Amino acid sequence: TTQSLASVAYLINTLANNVLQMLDIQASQLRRMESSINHISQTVDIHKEKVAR
């Protein structure tokens, strides 16, 4: 029973850590891609204003 409890706890801990890291990586990707999309929007706005002028 002691071995079983220790092993189950260890396995659950490792899974939780892996899921946490995965989520954090995805959040970082989305932050970076948001920055790039904002830059593209700014460029498109600049182009449209130039055409209007």
Partner: protein, 78 residues
Amino acid sequence: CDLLHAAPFQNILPRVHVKEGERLDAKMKRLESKYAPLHLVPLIERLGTPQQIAIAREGDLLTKERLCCGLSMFEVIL
């Protein structure tokens, strides 16, 4: 009116009142260095990214050039 609001970020100070025994040039230099944190293009150039710098330059160029300063339309219509 649109231009009157871009002045702080573009370094267009007003004429300052120099009282007795003061230098206009040094006074204006002190005012300029007071407001130097508001100037946007050099700040982004120093701290920004190449894409940010290109976008900032383009935006500033668009902002400062308006028809009110040296263009007219009615004569062309006539």
